[PDB]
């Protein structure tokens, strides 16, 4: 019995070693691992016979549905299409923004003007919206 316990403990120790070299030393994008709220910093402390972890996490709330577009072009120029970087293009519901579209982060609702910092140029696609007048990011 003692031998069996020792072997399972060795395997368990390897798992702990792996989490210290991923879950603790750096942020991870895998999910599954660590706490279940995306991943943000985690900590570990000594415990009898083992290691004890604590994982800080992010929990979403109060979800709303909004209108969004796959990307934006230019009705005057089919090769001018853009797409958001790490975020989305949403129809505006905010009184500060005169523009019909706005940029948001995906972890939290928060509209902002679309700027070149939040976009990348992409090949055109038929599902992209075409702008009939003014789109400032790029203006041309």
């Amino acid at each position: 019995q003692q031998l069996v316990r020792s072997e399972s403990a060795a395997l368990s120790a390897q798992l702990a070693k792996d989490k210290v070299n991923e879950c603790v030393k750096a942020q991870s994008k895998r999910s599954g691992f660590c706490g279940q709220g995306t991943h943000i910093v985690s900590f570990v402390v000594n415990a009898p016979n083992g290691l004890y972890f604590m994982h800080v996490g992010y929990y979403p709330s109060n979800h709303i549905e909004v209108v969004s577009a796959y990307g934006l072009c230019d009705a005057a120029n089919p090769t001018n299409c853009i797409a958001p970087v790490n975020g989305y293009f949403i129809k505006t519901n905010n009184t500060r923004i005169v523009d019909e579209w706005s940029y948001t982060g995906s972890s939290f609702y928060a509209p902002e003007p679309i700027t070149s910092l939040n976009t990348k140029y992409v090949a055109p696609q038929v599902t992209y919206q075409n702008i009939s007048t003014n789109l400032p990011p790029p203006l041309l």
Partner: antibody
Amino acid sequence: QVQLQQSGPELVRPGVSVKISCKGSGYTFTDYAIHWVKQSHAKSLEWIGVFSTYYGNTNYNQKFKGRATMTVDKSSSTAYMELARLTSEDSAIYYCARKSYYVDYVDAMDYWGQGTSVT
Amino acid sequence: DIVLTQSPASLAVSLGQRATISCRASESVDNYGISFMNWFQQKPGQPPKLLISATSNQGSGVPARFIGSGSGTDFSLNIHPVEEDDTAMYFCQQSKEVPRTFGGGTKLEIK
């Protein structure tokens, strides 16, 4: 308690630019865009332009692209607007208005200024 | 922006009479079913006032008597309790696209 105080009317001579103002009161001035419209007759009105009070972003009626502009003094909580190159055909009643969203994604003109005029 | 028109150019009614206003658009204005139609009220010597929005027949500064109606190119206003202080010019406005133009309007009057 939202208010706009539009500036008084003037009989400005042609070829002179004309400035209009409408300071905010009772709300945070920087959180809502200003809308500007023109009334040449009780049955004839048109949009002139919009100015974000937070980012300074604008759009204008294309007839006025070489004409009128809008500015804001955020420290004074006030909006200003001006029309280049006045002509006798431009005499009109003008109104400041505040942007709102009573319905999702629908621009509403909400509160209106008492009106001013130019001749 | 899409052109708006309205009819009859003026309407005269008895007190407490039901009444309506037609308001055609040159092109359908619905985008994702949003509609973007606003109605406004004005009297001489005064600024326009917001009345209703395409999904709001209550609130938006008015009593439930201002009933919005229609879809696509056709819209209307329906008021069952007209009173003398409801006599005003009325204006459809389209927020779907810039310039955000609006109709010349019609005017209600008590006989």
